[PDB]
Amino acid sequence: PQITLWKRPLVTIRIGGQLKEALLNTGADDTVLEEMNLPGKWKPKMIGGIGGFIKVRQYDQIPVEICGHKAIGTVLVGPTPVNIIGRNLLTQIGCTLNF
Amino acid sequence: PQITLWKRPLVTIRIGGQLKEALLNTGADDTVLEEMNLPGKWKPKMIGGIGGFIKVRQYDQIPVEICGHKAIGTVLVGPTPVNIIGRNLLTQIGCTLNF
């Protein structure tokens, strides 16, 4: 689809059988989702942006469905203000910025 | 053009006689730039990131050239780790996400 930007680019994603609303963020290297338990081992990590750092749990090779498009990659879980889909998964679904 | 996301989407922007590299950020409601004096009245504002909030100065009706595309709007100035072009200006140059 084509998403305009007059409103925040929020889409529905499916992960671990649960539906969640997430922001398509070209300004994020990685994908960060709100606190939730996911299967598989995880490693502690620290990521940052405006305001400073936060501690997250890194899960690898996690299948995520974005607007019907499948992706399998790294997902960070932590106290983020909104679910964020970063470039690591945006590239997998073939997302581009155009103008 | 069509910008792929294998790498951070940085572009050159022009403000007055000033050149700066800025990130085309669909995950940002507003545009914030790193230290640079702008003309006119400015109002204090608080904006939120992944780790908390920072204080910035809000300047309105600022002409900004993005990749040969003219845009005019609110520009925030504060301690952002990266110059950011937010949705307020991305909409003016007809920028969309596509997949």
Partner: peptide
């Protein structure tokens, strides 16, 4: 520090 640049304008 510049990896996740979400920015809330409110």
């Amino acid at each position: 520090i510049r990896k996740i640049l979400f920015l809330d304008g409110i």
